Design a protein around this nucleic acid. Sequence first.
RNA 1: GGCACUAUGGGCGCAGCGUCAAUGACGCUGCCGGUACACGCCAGACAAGAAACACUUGUCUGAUAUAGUGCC
Lengths: 226, 215
Amino acid sequence: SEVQLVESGGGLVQPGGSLRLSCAASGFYISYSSIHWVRQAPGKGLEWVASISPYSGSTYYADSVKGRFTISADTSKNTAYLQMNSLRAEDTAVYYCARQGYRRRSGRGFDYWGQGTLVTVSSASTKGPSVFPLAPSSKSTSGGTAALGCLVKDYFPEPVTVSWNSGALTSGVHTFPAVLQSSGLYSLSSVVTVPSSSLGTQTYICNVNHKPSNTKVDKKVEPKSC
Amino acid sequence: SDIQMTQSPSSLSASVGDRVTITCRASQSVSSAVAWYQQKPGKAPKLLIYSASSLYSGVPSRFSGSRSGTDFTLTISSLQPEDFATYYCQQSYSFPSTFGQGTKVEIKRTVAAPSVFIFPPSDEQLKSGTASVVCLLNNFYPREAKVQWKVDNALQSGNSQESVTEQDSKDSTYSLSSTLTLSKADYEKHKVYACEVTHQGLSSPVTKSFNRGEC
RNA sequence: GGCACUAUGGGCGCAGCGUCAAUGACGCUGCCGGUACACGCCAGACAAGAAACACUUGUCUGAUAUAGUGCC
């Protein structure tokens, strides 16, 4: 409760750039603990990265970061750091700091973890999405429900927000995780199941907001009839 | 060299009240420096077990850790709804520290067939030189589902991407999208665009297709 | 791991210089060789110290000690 790790410093940087992450500790004097950094690439698991041992300043590293990252600690600021130099897109992840417990109370387990700080390594530049109808069809549509949607395509960085009907329509909407395309731009798509009797009678609009590029887009998804 | 922790199973489908055992297997002696963690989406991991078997302060007593040589198992004696998350083992016997790949604990339910839809590209998109064909699998269980793209009965490879939603809060189905990406030039070199889906709730693989150019 | 043989001035020869290294290598040269023991001293191992390593302290071990080859 009173122990707290508060991380900062993440952000977006071009490959080969650098970034200094910070982990400010409260509730305890940092010098009597090992501080570890653990990272987690989007969708992957936890990967230990660097650690620093108390009373000696001894530091250890993962081979995937050896030579490029430097764990350190300023006890006067009660904060641990991770200088990351020459960053690479494989290094994109949510970066955690964690405290190694007191030996007697919780072994070598990491009992308290910072909140997460996001690191994105990319040479892509900002791009607002192109929004494309996922129009429903004339065939099939025999299940009393039809499906329709929007393709939110070629944006960077995350996130977009997709609503329908300016937020009015939410039941049966699926907005998938965005995938990173090989071009280094992202795409997701938002789809909604609706009663198949409303298709021509009811208007469906998907509203896509991409704050970084200051782009809001509203797309009307219409049938094509014959 | 480096110590490998290998977890088992990588995902698990249980209902409330189950005994759930997750197992993790180490490549060298880690002694007893194995820790288990619980992580929920968007959130920092939480410590459950330290020293391979010891119950971290504040954790429910339904969690237990066990050691057998290099073979470590976390077992949750009685699954609770707040326990559906992902679990990790860790070795801290030596550096580098190493985490198991992860086990995801998921909600069991009756099989639900994926209701399948195919969406052709917008003429607006073709103006961009790229064409996306989207195949949608709606509200299905269990998660395992193979989506196979065919253009004129020829399978595609390396030109599609998938994305799965998490288990729905209400009917705990999944939904999945698959996007086939093509150049416009290749898109118009073909007619029959088809999506083939294999799933446990499908008696035989279901296929949705269209012919490029239907009014 | 066990068995077998094989080898070991402090377990700490006494030193010097060049030392590179990154902790992986050391070596030549000189100097002199009661024996144990007691210590010291160093090196291991172990614990504890807010403590994985280093550090500090305590305890233990370095003769049944380390070092090979074959057998199994």
